[PDB]
């Protein structure tokens, strides 16, 4: 067997968890951005591969040079426009290369507040779900950018069922019509190649309209007849209210919380005490498009 | 270098034997007309039996189940609700003491999931929850027969990180010591904080719980115009013991222990930039900590 | 913005994670394999999505009970023929499915030996490279099955270089002809249709061309002059040896262990104390196929 | 309330994880220990905490360019005695240190075998359970050293009930003489100040101690009639076999494996599909001593 005999179906490399805190000062005033960036390549040759011949590869090392560098020269006004600069510099500087992919998700640092007063340079770390973008260019292609949110877990008590599911000889699954709705959402959305609108303002929108589409109205909330529902009513809430969003991609990872039966301990649970099952869990997944983004391709 | 081609239980002894159930998991919710509350909590408890037959004898007439401590816990929470998981820790000690001989020592952690109300513009959502992880809160609970029923609380997995007011200077130099003096630099710390109560069960303890929290929080970051230099890790361990202790005269003892993470000012001279403290990279591993417990004189003297 | 304004590019659900023990009795001798499944499903409507209407909906519960069921009738032999079984069952069953895929991975529980004889019933968790496979199927097309390794880390102290690479203004690495090589390897590869085989046997084989591609001969070794060229070596190794792998994708995360500098601590450190840098770290990943494979794919 | 009021009861401070491999060359043959080593120290006076003076802190960074020189200038035979000369050099060195606690882990690498033959350089992680110790001093007392094995994951399909236990009116459990036993062990043993022997020899017997005392014979097993018997079994078969064990620390953190109830899917399952519990969980914790040490603790 020789290289006569195979195809290269798909080659790529690059510099992973590369991260760092870009610090910026307004006088005494200190704002923090740090980030988790991935740059992945596609080369137009694979002589590193197939002769051991290394003349167009680019370091590993190189890629997180030049991340870091952008970040100096640039600063991070958002995540999505230093994703476009990296991508953009890969591109205009090497023409080995075919393909790049930049991911960067943002540690999830809150300014301190005493009292309600902002500190001018402390911070916490708060993980109410992980903010990410996604940037990729072919050779020549349209630049597309990605922003998203992952690891983000919501929960109501009420206003959740499940009901009129297919039945056959192994369906041993109650229908209910109240029980606890917990989900881990991982959401990612395309703006195509529209790259004029302030990123952070948008970013913050499309959350707002996950949680309130999740919850419902505060004082009474919405019926969610399905997981699969909710996913669908996250996904029309965004696309209604967020023009730039053209595709949305939503994963719900469930936990049931079981109402555990306590009658042989001697007393009655009326969904008093609940038992999450982490594992196994259920997920679903959906991606919807516009159909006039879609049809312009 | 023996006599004998076995031990036996005559040539040793016990210095300990504990045993329990880990991560008993649940969620204990509480409707009020249409309002939703809700405290799920993972539970450990812990006993030791004044008898160990069942290690040394293959005897188990005297073991309580580990199932049988999972059930007196959930349905301690049936009957009871969860007021705060302090009060919940106290209750499940005291039916271990009060209902079983064999049980010579009890000990009940508990830590909170961190569920948050939802808000749409400033209004609390009936029923709608988001996970906010900014500090786990925990108890725990522990008694001896016939000692003191003693309850700490703590919060842990807790990351601060201000940007100025830090260095590290004045420190002992040998012929190993490589570590420049520093004035500026940024002090990133995961704390874990446990503090003492001893027998005092007669407060609020949620709210004693969030003025320590913004005790640690004060005093880790100075006032919010101005901050407070920090000399080392050590000495902001002691700004926050001595902030606790002065303004929440139920803690008896305070432990702190800061996990720190150096932030690298990255050489950027061979790649032809200047970096003025503007890109900095973080060291994970290895990393340093430091770990002090205060407590009042007053009451480690009386005991 | 209506469904009329929208398009439904992928609707996906299943169950994870369904862990379970399968074990089989010889007399006194036991036997065990412990296995996560993951099984997704796409239906040919999306109504519990757009319509509120759950009529076609498969129960994620009624999945993990169709696993067990399968486990408990039929054995399991080996994880490729169990997720083959779940696949054909999904697609035999219900119309209403237009594609099925099972996840695979064992729990790395080997038989507790003592002094050379093997434990009756005694076993130990020994995790060198987690065993997978995958089966899917889209209704009407094949039935195509994938093994692999994953968490594989091997490492060898010499013959590793990485030099005449590309240089530019924002390039520092030196060339270095000696080097740890350090590597973490997720492989996986296609046996396509083909279902005849020894699935244990082909799986222990294709092992043990990694192994000894990676290392070369145990008296000398054999230069590498980069992780893709190793990766390379690897996927050349399978494929001359193994014929029933179709396609193999091999992804190598490494770990530069750097030579510590100790001059301001008054010693030379000749390639004796080595630090890992864990993060950042390096990737590669290749994916190659037989020509015979790919054309008769058309 | 002031420093007058409040007492210092401990102050702690140290490096944590310092990763390194340090690599060893006879001729073309290559040797491989990798660590990772934990270093604390507590100091005489606490002016860093109570008055912002570091006069008397030996940098945490210092620790750790220690460890790194100490692995350079000596090699490491074992880890325990590796352990034992880093507490030795801070105790001969600075007179600040009142205490010093060392704890070191082995990266499970084993040298990969190509027919039969020992590779010169190339090396498999193989986790099998991970090897630790920890060495102490206190200023003018014993240097004590700890070896242990954490992580070692132990399950046998039979020979183990749970029986004849407490019964009240919260106890649900039904009376087992057959079940799968499954453990994940911690177990950590003090040799006092005992340093004359091979410190690999007696770590390898302990750990066969702990995997022949949880089994029992290969061609029948011993039956279990709790999971802290078999915790008994475990420390008296290590103090029976090996005397430089002084105290003896084991804790077996269980999984049950329930026979899932397949009535109502139409079919029996005769123990042979087990789903495990992961949580909530059961432990059981025993510390041994021998008489003869703690007496001879006057
Ligand atoms: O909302 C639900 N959707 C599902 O697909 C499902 N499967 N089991 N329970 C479920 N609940
Ligand atoms: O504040 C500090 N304390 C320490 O003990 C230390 N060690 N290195 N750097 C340090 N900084
Ligand atoms: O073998 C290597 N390949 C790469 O792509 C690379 N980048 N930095 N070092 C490297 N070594
Ligand atoms: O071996 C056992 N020991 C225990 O203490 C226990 N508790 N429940 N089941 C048990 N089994
Ligand atoms: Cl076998
Ligand atoms: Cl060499």
């Given at each position: 067997?020789?290289?006569?005999?195979?195809?290269?179906?798909?080659?790529?490399?690059?510099?992973?968890?590369?991260?760092?805190?870009?610090?910026?000062?307004?006088?005494?005033?200190?704002?923090?951005?740090?980030?988790?960036?991935?740059?992945?390549?596609?080369?137009?040759?694979?002589?590193?591969?197939?002769?051991?011949?290394?003349?167009?590869?680019?370091?590993?090392?190189?890629?997180?040079?030049?991340?870091?560098?952008?970040?100096?020269?640039?600063?991070?006004?958002?995540?999505?426009?230093?994703?476009?600069?990296?991508?953009?510099?890969?591109?205009?500087?090497?023409?080995?290369?075919?393909?790049?992919?930049?991911?960067?998700?943002?540690?999830?640092?809150?300014?301190?507040?005493?009292?309600?007063?902002?500190?001018?340079?402390?911070?916490?770390?708060?993980?109410?779900?992980?903010?990410?973008?996604?940037?990729?260019?072919?050779?020549?292609?349209?630049?597309?950018?990605?922003?998203?949110?992952?690891?983000?877990?919501?929960?109501?008590?009420?206003?959740?069922?499940?009901?009129?599911?297919?039945?056959?000889?192994?369906?041993?699954?109650?229908?209910?019509?109240?029980?606890?709705?917990?989900?881990?959402?991982?959401?990612?959305w395309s703006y195509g190649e529209c790259?004029?609108?302030?990123?952070?303002?948008?970013?913050?929108?499309?959350?707002?309209?996950?949680?309130?589409?999740?919850?419902?109205?505060?004082?009474?909330?919405?019926?969610?007849?399905?997981?699969?529902?909710?996913?669908?009513?996250?996904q029309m809430?965004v696309l209604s209210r967020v023009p730039q969003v053209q595709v949305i991609e939503?994963?719900?990872?469930?936990?049931?919380?079981?109402?555990?039966?306590?009658?042989?301990?001697?007393?009655?649970?009326?969904?008093?005490?609940?038992?999450?099952?982490?594992?196994?869990?259920?997920?679903?997944?959906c991606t919807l498009g516009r159909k006039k983004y879609l049809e312009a391709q």
């Open positions: 067997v020789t290289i006569k005999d195979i195809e290269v179906l798909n080659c790529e490399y690059g510099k992973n968890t590369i991260k760092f805190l870009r610090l910026h000062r307004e006088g005494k005033k200190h704002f923090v951005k740090e980030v988790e960036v991935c740059t992945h390549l596609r080369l137009t040759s694979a002589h590193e591969y197939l002769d051991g011949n290394n003349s167009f590869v680019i370091p590993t090392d190189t890629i997180k040079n030049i991340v870091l560098v952008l970040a100096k020269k640039n600063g991070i006004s958002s995540i999505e426009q230093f994703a476009i600069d990296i991508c953009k510099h890969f591109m205009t500087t090497f023409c080995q290369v075919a393909y790049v992919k930049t991911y960067i998700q943002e540690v999830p640092w809150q300014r301190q507040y005493q009292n309600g007063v902002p500190h001018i340079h402390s911070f916490i770390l708060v993980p109410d779900g992980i903010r990410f973008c996604e940037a990729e260019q072919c050779r020549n292609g349209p630049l597309v950018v990605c922003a998203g949110i992952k690891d983000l877990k919501l929960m109501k008590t009420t206003q959740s069922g499940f009901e009129g599911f297919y039945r056959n000889e192994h369906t041993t699954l109650p229908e209910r019509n109240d029980r606890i709705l917990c989900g881990e959402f991982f959401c990612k790259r004029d609108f302030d990123f952070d303002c948008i970013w913050s929108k499309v959350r707002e309209c996950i949680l309130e589409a999740f919850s419902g109205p505060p004082d009474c909330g919405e019926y969610s007849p399905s997981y699969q529902r909710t996913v669908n009513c996250i809430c939503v994963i719900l990872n469930n936990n049931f919380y079981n109402v555990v039966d306590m009658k042989a301990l001697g007393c009655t649970n009326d969904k008093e005490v609940l038992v999450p099952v982490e594992t196994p869990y259920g997920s679903c997944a």
